[PDB]
Assembly symmetry: C3
Homo-oligomer: 117 residues x 3
């Protein structure tokens, strides 16, 4: 899975090690191995969420097969909100998530695409 987290919290208000802990969290939530989770955190940005510039965060989650239905994205959302509200000390009104299905031909790995791996 690919997770991208944008936040207006400065880097020194994003707990040390968050990107590693988000791999373990995404593994348990999405049912994929932690060693296939990719996380990118971009702190210190200028952000408004719901029209407001108080601390907030946006997460994007992309994966093959598991982020394409409303019923399973509802479950994934509940778990990622519990992880992020606690780690970032943010209320649930200050986080949004977007889910993006991917296909094997879209993923470049080791100089080829996943269709051939």
């Amino acid at each position: 899975p690919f997770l991208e987290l944008d936040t207006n919290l400065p880097a020194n208000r994003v707990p040390a090690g968050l990107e590693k802990r988000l791999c373990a969290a995404a593994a348990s939530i999405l049912g994929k191995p932690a060693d296939r989770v990719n996380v990118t955190v971009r702190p210190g940005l200028a952000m408004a969420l719901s029209g407001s510039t108080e601390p907030c965060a946006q997460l994007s989650i992309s994966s093959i097969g598991v982020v394409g239905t409303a019923e399973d994205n509802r479950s994934h959302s509940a778990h990622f909100f519990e992880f992020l509200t606690k780690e970032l000390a943010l209320g649930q009104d200050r986080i949004l998530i977007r889910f993006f299905p991917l296909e094997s031909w879209q993923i470049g790995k080791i100089g080829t695409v996943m269709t051939f791996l």
Copy 2:
């Protein structure tokens, strides 16, 4: 709506308050409330646009229902170019926009997805 703005202008050449003013602009252009607009600005990046590294900016706009047609994206583009050229002191050759329709099952909010809200 979700707006993401990447620019190679340093933070001190992005006018104070831009992320808030972009919520008001996106509300009027897209016909959605300012308190449902989310803006992320990422300044100080290394960018080439049309092969050139002079100051530039890229905007991505994602929303349900309103960014899926050429005719209405033409109108949205005209208005967002007027806003960004003036705010960022950039010529129209130095900005590009991408539009991305979203569905309700893709948006995680308050620990569920918008399909159930």
Copy 3:
């Protein structure tokens, strides 16, 4: 084409001029002019790739017509991995690429969309 490169290498470990050289590389690989290539590099991020926080990079490539098949994305992947492993001094295990087809109605340019240009 639009290329976005996220990396946990600090800016001073991303060779000067990379964004310009990536325009020339993408032109030859994708068969589009260098003056229609757009590159965004976001260094200094916090990243885990395959569960590990050692130096790494993620590239996203979006274009009309040329990034929609497994067979041609396999070729594009091979060439972009050769360019990035050498430029960033990274092993092939430390880079991933995602490919995203775009349509003309999604691209805002000069205050309109590409459908009308």
